[PDB]
Design a protein around this nucleic acid. Structure first.
Ligand SMILES: [Mg+2]
Ligand SMILES: [Mg+2]
Ligand SMILES: [Mg+2]
Ligand SMILES: [Mg+2]
Ligand SMILES: [Mg+2]
Ligand SMILES: [Mg+2]
Lengths: 770, 770
DNA sequence: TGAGGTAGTAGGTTGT
DNA sequence: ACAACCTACTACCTCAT
DNA sequence: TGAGGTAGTAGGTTGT
DNA sequence: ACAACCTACTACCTCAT
DNA sequence: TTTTTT
DNA sequence: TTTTTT
């Protein structure tokens, strides 16, 4: 099918294209030839109305003649047609500013129809973001409406000038509080310092220090007789009862991490966080930053109407989109009562209703898991523990215990008996069957304070003592609402170290997610999701795709920052076929690295010993590589080297999720724009908000040490959309990313927290990190 | 016993002690109140004849009145007696320079009796290093004679100006070559850039670039008409046939690692490395930097004789040392023919002659291993592989194969049969016994190019295919001389991943270490060492100490850098007793960190689940903690927190191996100086050189959250000396560091290369990283 | 990389 | 010219009867 | 931390 | 005012007959 | 509802 | 000397 939709793009008149472009080459960084801190090769090319076409060799392209006080050589001339499309778009975007078409102007135009509002102590201000895209031979401007939230009160006029209140404020927001200094014209963000173990802030009470810093702020920046008037009006006199906060830089470009700083809690403001604000106010600050497609369309049309210039057009652009058929969603292969491989279509049911029979067994068909792991043939008995945070009230603890026990016995055991016996065990003897989750007897319910080291030590000691001689166990943790991080991660890591798979539920769910009719029971949605997630963590694949993929492997790659270091960690997820029609999932860990660039040589070496069929078994094996972000130049250069030796053919694509392009409709679709493909694979069930598409770009084929660029066809889009529909963490899931990228992200995040179990469950689809 | 020895210390006249010391406090870094190049708080205190007594708060102590162009406050006055001993010593050292007693003067005085020599293209220059120590109430100056090696030829006049020769030089020293720019007055060191995979340098041939850089060097630094004369005399004209080398900073303080640099191979020199120089010249450059104790004594006495000043004395100092008895070395507990526990004393044999019977069995007693791992009760079968680098000649390959097979069968199997049968298997049935190392049949000898990725892949494939269904194997690798790093480590890591323990021998050993009588056999020393190391890697402890230690555990801690990251890795080694008389070794991995400071909270949490007896079983457990280096303030602060909860008592000591203090004698001894203990535990078997002592300092006791400083007694020194004599990597070993620190270093280095086997052999004494 | 020792080259962290 | 210390790498030299 | 979506705050790497 | 993307964290809102 | 089933 | 011993 097809349709016509309106997108937030406006055409650009061709008269803006420059006639003559000069090219210059520098010999040294402008920051060193001269001495002006902050000056870079990009600022020099910006001030001359130009772009940087070679950052390594310092080669820039300019419209005017270069006005530089250093050393350079002119490399000649160039025409607009000899630049690449990206640089053409960047140059056109730069030229749009010289005609008054800038973000500073369009934001002011927008703020005539949407006014900056004030909620509590914060202000929300609309703004726009502008980009340029070359579709075929015409340039289009992309305008995206965003909001910014700022604080109108300093840290002094927030705690009512009581130092103790400042102490509570600093201590209760220890993890994620940052202070921005507004008295400076750089607006640098700092982080407060805290004492180890004992917590508590690090204040210093000394009048001389505060006097020196206040006078330094006056003298260094506002060094005119006039400016001191607004300095005294904005912040007042030199308050002396205010302590000084120990703080460090939030960034690291300056480096030299011995730079102590003293912050006066009178010239700084908190940045923004809804955790430090009342719920009734956070509800209305939100729902103002989210706009329906119609509101965006009317606002953009008004902005275009109130622009007086020939350069840009007066109406938004319309594009032709290709709709996605409904039949594509219903392409999964579940297994029925007997043990067949019936499509889910021929049961008059949808994927969401997959465990409705376990509570009724009279109105909905009985549906059984498609795949069960191999180690469950020998493993038939699994201990289960219930851990409860002592910070909850007794009624909540009893409710959580009862809910966990009922979930295990009433819901899981029915499936465990209908699968193991009714459909399997042909004559008193079968091999693969669902295990048994004990929870039997006392001393398996642990009630310790999970927010302290002593409680965690006691919990670990108890579980380890009970776990002697065993190899796989399950745990249900009922945690409090305010459980700090580095304690959640610690609990999960120390439980994984004993080969115990854990599932955590927080207090707010146990108190506000009660059922519709029976208000003394957990909601059906939550219970079904919990059972599905536990089954997926135990290695059971409840359904598989009915699609037939043309490749032999599908690999997703992602990179995550380290916890306490300056480095990065790579992670990947690999899906095999062995016929095309059925897939498995195995996570692969790539080593540490210095930047966001995966060493493709070490990845394939690690992907050879973890295999049996090799990458060159008998003939050429085709590999599909989806990259979260973009394929860097080093990754592409290192793929030709692998293709030279291993004799494989790689097809690489880039998946992007943060782009300013929007389509003003609510349906699953895709369209081709600027050489890339924008795909909306999901539908929004909430009233307020606009769906964010997925950008597929830069498809290329590498073989025999050669790279050939290609264009994305319809089959690739259909394959990506099909891979989108494979989620093992939620039955009623409508996600955006494809499965390999989605699970590579989670595996990288798990490695960041050093969550490893046995290295042998990973090979058979155990997904503890899901 | 006792003796009197001469140490390189000279007394200092008390008249130098200052009368009045001023104290000042700054408000901001002098690099920011003003704008200089590298001005710091330490340079400011140096130029005012003073020290920095508080770096965090910027509090400095000065002798003169402070002359500063910024903001500061005087904190009052202080007397010399109120400073700590370290700051008193630093102040006295600073005051020694104002009287002409500096390194620049004493080095010039020394260079009258030792002249700077020239070997090949390098120059060796003597110099001195000076320190100050306060022993009881008098200050002593420590003078240490060192040498410096510099290059008198640029990179241009080293390759005879042939660009191809320059390419060969750059490619053959790719790993460890650095270039220092001598045309600059900062003498900054750079590292050349190379192309990935394909290797080869990164040169740029362009006359304009070389002209610009040469003129920039002339203009920026030597900006006087006179200086250009020596610039033209030193380096010559602007040579134009010289390419430009791509290079980056060797350091990282500047950061911003996109700042490429172009180096002219005419203004830079190699720094120094004996790998790039002829062997006959490297032999004579060495043996000139090493001095016997007598030469050092005469040189220092001459230096003191030719000093005209009252400030320092005219003769070296004499100290009273306590000798170490011979009986202490012979305190190991080996096990005899029957299987008893006789001390090695009652056999008329020494530790080195521990396997002389396996070749004679008629002149020396038969000696059996004390301990054998528990996993060998079930394991009775071990595959053995022989891997040979294809870069060796055929005769060397055959010799290596024959030597490995003979080592396994003639030497090991005799022990394996005398232990398993003659002494064990009382009635046809025993449990613990030595396994069998196959090398059975062909297809267990692998000959592939180990310097390339293809050869490593093939080797891994073959070993993994043969290793199917097994759990422990052994490998002997015969590698070439020039085997580059990152290939050795890769081979070891990929072999460990298959649970194969490897031992590597290089080509130079197989060609020059032939036996005395039979020149077609490997030397006895090398063969015995190889067998001992293999046995230790397999978990067999051939001997244990006869000492009785007063503590329950001994823990050694070390920190190592990361390979591709900016971070650090902690490692530790723990020795248990369970009675005080016997010891086991278990390595413990501490997590990643940002600096050289181990998180003591996470270490003890990891040391609880890896235990069974806990740190608080029934009563107080004493822990001894030896730190490689020094205990940082954060580590000490985090130990009181642990002592508060876990109810343990920790005794911490600092072990230092790089200090300028020397004793002019050759015997095992120790003495007390400046509050620290200097211990010489080994004897030098080479003619040239002086033994380097071990500095034990800063003993302290932590319990109930309280820290009490203590003094090192004789029992602590005896314990450290006894722990020194426990090495499992060499039978004829006389090392310096204690065993826990020595093995913590190796475990940290192994973690740096990610060498992990199964996490279950680690807990029971396997030492694959030794 | 037989392993330990004594010699060099370069760089980093801590201090409190 | 900020002291003390760590780390990585390279080279020779000696070991038991 | 039921899991996914849409909204904010801050920071980093790549380009070639 | 260097684009164009990634990461970490926080908050609400909706889900299957 | 602090289990079954064999 | 590209093994035993059971
Ligand atoms: Mg990414
Ligand atoms: Mg990700
Ligand atoms: Mg989860
Ligand atoms: Mg260390
Ligand atoms: Mg070490
Ligand atoms: Mg070794």
């Amino acid at each position: 099918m097809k349709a016509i939709v309106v997108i937030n793009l406006v055409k650009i008149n061709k008269k803006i294209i420059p006639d003559k472009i000069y090219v210059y080459r520098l010999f040294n960084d402008p920051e060193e030839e001269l001495q002006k801190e902050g000056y870079s090769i990009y600022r020099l090319a910006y001030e001359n109305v130009g772009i940087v076409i070679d950052p390594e060799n310092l080669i820039i392209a300019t419209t005017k003649e270069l006005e530089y006080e250093g050393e350079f050589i002119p490399e000649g001339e160039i025409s607009f047609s000899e630049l690449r499309n990206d640089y053409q778009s960047k140059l056109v975007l730069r030229l749009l500013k010289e005609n008054g078409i800038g973000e500073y102007e369009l934001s002011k135009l927008l703020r005539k129809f949407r006014k900056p509002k004030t909620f509590g102590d914060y202000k929300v201000i609309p703004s726009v973001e502008m980009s340029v895209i070359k579709h075929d031979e015409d340039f289009y401007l992309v305008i995206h409406i965003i909001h910014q939230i700022q604080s109108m009160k300093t840290l002094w006029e927030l705690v009512n000038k009581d130092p103790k209140e400042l102490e509570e404020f600093l201590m209760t927001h220890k993890e994620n509080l940052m202070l921005k200094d507004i008295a400076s014209p750089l607006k640098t963000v700092y982080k407060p310092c805290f004492e180890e173990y004992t917590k508590k802030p690090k204040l210093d009470h000394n009048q001389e220090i505060v006097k020196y810093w206040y006078n330094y702020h006056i003298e260094r920046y506002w060094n005119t007789p006039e400016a001191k008037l607004e300095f005294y009006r904005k912040f007042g006199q030199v308050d002396l009862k205010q302590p000084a906060i120990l703080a460090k830089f939030a960034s690291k470009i300056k480096k030299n991490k011995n730079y102590k700083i003293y912050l006066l809690p009178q010239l700084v403001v908190p940045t923004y966080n809804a955790e430090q604000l009342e719920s009734d106010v956070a509800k209305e600050i939100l729902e103002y930053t989210k706009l329906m497609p119609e509101e965006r369309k009317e606002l953009l049309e008004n902005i275009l109407a109130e622009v007086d210039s020939d350069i840009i057009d007066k109406s938004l652009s319309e594009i032709e989109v290709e709709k996605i058929a409904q039949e594509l969603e219903n392409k999964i292969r579940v297994r029925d009562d007997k043990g067949n491989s019936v499509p889910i279509s021929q049961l008059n049911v949808q994927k969401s209703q997959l465990l409705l029979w376990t509570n009724y067994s009279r109105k909905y068909p009985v549906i059984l898991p498609y795949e069960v792991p191999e180690k469950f043939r020998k493993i038939r008995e699994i201990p289960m523990f219930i851990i409860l945070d002592s910070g909850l009230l007794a009624d909540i603890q009893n409710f959580a215990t009862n809910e966990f026990r009922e979930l295990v016995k009433s819901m899981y055991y029915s499936l465990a008996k209908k699968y193991n016996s009714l459909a399997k065990k042909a004559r008193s003897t079968n091999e693969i069957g669902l295990p048994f989750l004990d929870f039997r007897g006392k001393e398996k319910v642990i009630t310790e304070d999970l927010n302290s080291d002593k409680g965690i030590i006691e919990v670990v000691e108890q579980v380890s003592s009970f776990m002697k001689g065993k190899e796989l166990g399950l745990a249900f943790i009922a945690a409090r609402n305010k459980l700090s991080s580095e304690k959640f991660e610690e609990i999960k890591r120390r439980l994984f170290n004993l080969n115990v798979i854990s599932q955590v539920v927080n207090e707010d769910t146990l108190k506000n997610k009660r059922d519709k009719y029976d208000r003394n029971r957990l909601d059906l949605f939550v219970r079904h999701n919990l059972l599905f997630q536990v089954l997926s963590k135990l290695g059971v694949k409840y359904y598989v795709l009915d699609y037939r993929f043309n490749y032999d492997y599908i690999i997703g790659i992602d990179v995550a920052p380290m916890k306490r270091s300056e480095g990065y960690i790579g992670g990947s997820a690999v899906m095999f076929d062995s016929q095309g029609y059925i897939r498995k999932i195995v996570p692969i860990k790539i080593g540490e690295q210095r930047g966001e660039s995966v060493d493709m040589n070490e990845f394939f070496k690690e992907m050879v010993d973890k295999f049996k069929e090799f990458n060159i078994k008998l003939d050429n094996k085709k590999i599909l590589l989806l990259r979260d972000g973009r394929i860097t130049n080093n990754e592409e250069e290192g793929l030709k080297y692998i293709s030279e030796m291993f004799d494989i053919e790689v097809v690489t694509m880039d998946v992007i999720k943060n782009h300013p392009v929007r389509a003003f409709a609510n349906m699953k679709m895709y369209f081709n724009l600027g050489g890339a493909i924008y795909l909306i694979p999901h539908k929004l069930k909430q009233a307020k908000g606009t769906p964010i598409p997925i950008k597929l770009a830069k498809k290329r084929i590498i073989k025999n040490g050669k790279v050939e660029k290609q264009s994305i066809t319809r089959q690739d889009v259909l394959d990506i959309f099909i891979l989108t529909r494979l989620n093992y963490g939620s039955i009623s899931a409508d996600m955006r990313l494809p499965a390999p990228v989605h699970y590579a992200h989670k595996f990288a995040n798990a490695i960041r927290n050093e969550w490893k179990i046995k290295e042998e469950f990973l090979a058979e689809g155990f997904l503890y990190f899901v």
